[PDB]
Design a protein around this ligand. Structure first.
Ligand SMILES: C[C@H](N)C(=O)NS(=O)(=O)OC[C@H]1O[C@@H](n2cnc3c(N)ncnc32)[C@H](O)[C@@H]1O
Length: 156
């Protein structure tokens, strides 16, 4: 596993979820669409870790591959103005580059929100730190791993 992918594996291990495995695939997983095709999953099963900057800090939004994050909803949930983090901010905050941003192992653990639609799948796939890394897990484990709060995040 490449460094960033290893960093994520390490985080899964340190959390007590060592049985979850990061895989650096022979096919791209840069976008939810590609990720789903790479593992034969439904796009909705892909977890997009989206980082947004607020006035007093950063926030992690775990969105289903089939939904579009509603900034209006996110803003209300946090209770303050929010904005999509620039590629640069993603790197400084999380330590990973967009297209590979994982839900764990960041430079600072960010308060998180989980797209309630992810609770509809028995298993989901999140990014493992690179545009080729992914690790499968149950929504429950993703919740335990991030301590995120379930929420209505989609524009739809
Ligand atoms: C799972 C897959 N590896 C992945 O990383 N999916 S992702 O949705 O989290 O990554 C793509 C998302 O990053 C964000 N993004 C893409 N380009 C961006 C840019 N130029 N600036 C800020 N955010 C961007 C958008 O939400 C885009 O949908």
């Amino acid at each position: 596993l490449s460094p960033s992918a290893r960093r994520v594996q390490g985080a899964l291990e340190t959390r007590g979820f060592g049985h979850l495995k990061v895989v650096e695939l022979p096919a791209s997983t840069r976008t939810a669409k590609e990720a789903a095709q790479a593992v034969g999953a439904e796009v909705g099963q892909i977890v997009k870790s989206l980082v947004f900057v607020g006035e007093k800090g950063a926030y992690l939004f775990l969105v289903s591959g089939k939904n579009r994050l509603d900034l209006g909803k996110a803003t209300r949930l946090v209770g303050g103005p929010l904005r999509q983090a620039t590629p640069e901010e993603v790197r400084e905050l999380t330590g990973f580059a967009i297209g590979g941003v994982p839900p764990v192992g960041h430079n600072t653990p960010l308060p998180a929100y989980l797209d309630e639609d992810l609770l509809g799948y028995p298993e989901v796939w999140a990014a493992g730190g690179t545009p080729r890394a992914l690790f499968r897990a149950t929504p429950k484990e993703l919740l335990a791993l991030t301590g995120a709060q379930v929420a209505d995040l989609k524009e739809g």
